[PDB]
Design a protein around this ligand. Structure first.
Ligand SMILES: O=C(COc1ccccc1P(=O)(O)O)NCC(F)(F)c1ccccc1
Ligand SMILES: O=C(COc1ccccc1P(=O)(O)O)NCC(F)(F)c1ccccc1
Lengths: 18, 236, 236, 18
């Protein structure tokens, strides 16, 4: 679960950053 | 159809093997083969189709993001431009990505969606249609973008309408649909408030339905609820 | 040669981009293109060639290991055999792996090794020859195995002979060669004592030469020394 | 360095196990 959530957060954060 | 000579059951078995070996291109090709046999897919088979293509397109999107990030660094006076190479290679990846999205959309249109009568299957495929249009939208520009965005919206919306009528608020497919439509609103349609509203509403309505679930279903639903909450935290 | 129309410098630049995007199949194809331009490779370019193909073959080997592990579980009375599928798919991966190894060996033979006069380059390419024969050996059986093993040995040995004569004991290429030849001895040639002896000798002689290095070179040499020590710990 | 060493140990250990 933690890895899935971490993975999701990275993808979603990329949009916000860029 | 190079998979045309292989048994449906063999294609499915090899898709599972490819999954275990993390060979997602192979897995996708096997499941494409299975779809092209013309029969409806079972729940397990639908998951295999989704996992395979999600992983393939995921890789291409990640690469595209790296290259896009590099491209826009080189395009300025701050850093010496490197020539046409980064743009060319970014476009190659983009074209391959578009090819995979077009392949998936082709499968859904021929004829998975048409033949999906059950809510579980129909919502699953319409969600997928929305997803692959969303991935196309991420790399599109201008007017072509607007039509792609509308196609994604229309697929998601139809899926939403059925899921509200035919599925409980905790149904993982309904939840995953709402999560992805919410991401569409935020990242594609420039509607952050719609994204947040949808994620919050979805979370609250699922929360109030958790009491109906066994521990197995509880674990699956709370997983997606957690992604909804994670996204809300990021967006608010 | 689909890369035949693209500039050597562009192929190199795109190999670096593919590396950053973790697109190792692309990276390998670009570097193959660059090799086929016919010029010698620089140190940096040699590294790109190696990284690209090592990553491609690494993926195939990992998949092969998964499938082999599954295949041998199903082949017994303890577990219902699944039919020809696992064997067929394992063989498909094996054939692709053999194709990549054959491609690399083709490049080294046409004409990287022939044209490599400097110890640094020649040892690098002969090590690679040994490696890709070693990967072929991992999936070979019987008499075909024995000849492949001898080809790997001969390449490694020639590399060793030059490296001892022309390179200091801490040279990363010399160290990486010894590490891989040691792995060959242990995993391929059924010579664990030769593997251990070589790893220990290599480690001790590098240790006594560390004092000559700057901090940059020290870091590179100690990295491989640590892999040598890790392997020794595992083998003893 | 740690990841490289960990990666190496996994590959080498696989041979010993199988
Ligand atoms: O982790 C991510 C990051 O994004 C992607 C990463 C790769 C492909 C597509 C997407 P996208 O969400 O953009 O379609 N998404 C959530 C999930 F992995 F899909 C997921 C996991 C578990 C339950 C439900 C959903
Ligand atoms: O981590 C591994 C595990 O094995 C592989 C994994 C993938 C491909 C080939 C091999 P193989 O060693 O079998 O050629 N090997 C050591 C190293 F990654 F190559 C290495 C790293 C840093 C310095 C020197 C060497």
């Amino acid at each position: 679960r933690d890895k899935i959530r971490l993975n999701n957060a990275i993808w979603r954060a990329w949009y916000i950053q860029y | 159809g190079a998979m045309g000579s292989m048994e449906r059951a063999s294609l499915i078995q090899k898709a599972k093997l490819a999954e275990q070996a993390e060979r997602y291109e192979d897995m996708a090709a096997f499941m494409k083969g299975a779809v092209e046999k013309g029969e409806e897919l079972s729940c397990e088979e639908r998951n295999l189709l989704s996992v395979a293509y999600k992983n393939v397109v995921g890789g291409q999107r990640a690469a595209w993001r790296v290259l896009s990030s590099i491209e826009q660094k080189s395009n300025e006076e701050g850093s010496e431009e490197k020539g046409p190479e980064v743009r060319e290679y970014r476009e190659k990846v983009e074209t391959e990505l578009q090819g995979v999205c077009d392949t998936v959309l082709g499968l859904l249109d021929s004829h998975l969606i048409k033949e999906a009568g059950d809510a579980e299957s129909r919502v699953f495929y319409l969600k997928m249609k929305g997803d692959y249009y969303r991935y196309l939208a991420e790399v599109a520009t201008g007017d072509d973008k607007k039509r792609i965005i509308d196609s994604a919206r229309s697929a998601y919306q139809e899926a939403m309408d059925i899921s509200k009528k035919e599925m409980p608020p905790t149904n993982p497919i309904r939840l995953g649909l709402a999560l992805n439509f919410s991401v569409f609103h935020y990242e594609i349609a420039n509607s952050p408030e719609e994204a947040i509203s949808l994620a919050k509403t979805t979370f609250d309505e699922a929360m109030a339905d958790l009491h109906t679930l066994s521990e197995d279903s509880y674990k699956d639903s709370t997983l997606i609820m957690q992604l909804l909450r994670d996204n809300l935290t990021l967006w608010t």
